[model samples]
Target: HHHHHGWSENLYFQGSTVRIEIRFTNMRREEVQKELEKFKERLKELEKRTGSEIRIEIEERDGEVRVEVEIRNSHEEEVRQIIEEIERWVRKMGGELRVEK
Candidate 1:
């Protein structure tokens, strides 16, 4: 099966930074709740595993859910690992992934 998803990461000399933004369209309340819970768990795991600071924000408008995740001051490999984990989750959930330089 094919799905539309987006994932992207950018690097800077100031710090090793990562941002993961996910948008879910027309989802029911229960699904949103479950997804958010899973997302939070993953964030916690990433923080512990990488010893990095992560910020998460969630917004719901109309019938769409948007989640923004940011990680700062982490190793490049750690950032890459987090991106891969997010990509896997998005693929499993049938969402699109896009990355930026």
Candidate 2:
């Protein structure tokens, strides 16, 4: 019944986490979904590398949208690496996001 023993061990020993926030102003829904597809693509690669599904949260208010993500320090290096590229993508699409990591 302890098949996940190593999982707990790793988290306890290397459980450093960070938060990234993506904030968007008034924008078209179609464009937003388009850029979001790219976000998921990058996350997929990261998921394969890290061996777990990353956690994310989405918020909506008025015409603004905020997306939040939590990642562990074990691979935070690569996590931040992926985020920089996403920032450029959003900017190119005339949108904006935030990062707290």
Predictions in order: lDDT? 0.70, 0.66
Residue 75 in model 2: lDDT:
68
Over 1-101, each residue of candidate 2 has an lDDT whose tens digit, in order, gives: 45553433223435566667767674577676666777777776787787545666667676677777767653656666667856764576456666664
For model 1, residues 16-55, the per-residue Cα lDDT tens digits are 6677777656446787678678878887987887768987
Off by over 4 Å in 2: 1-14, 51-53, 89-101
Model 1 poorest 10 in a row by lDDT: 92-101
> Best by TM-score, which number?
1
Clashes of each: 11, 0
Alpha carbon deviation, residue 48, candidate 1 (Å): 1.7
| Alpha carbon deviation, residue 11, candidate 1 (Å) | 18
Distance from true location, Cα of 43 in model 2, Å: 0.6
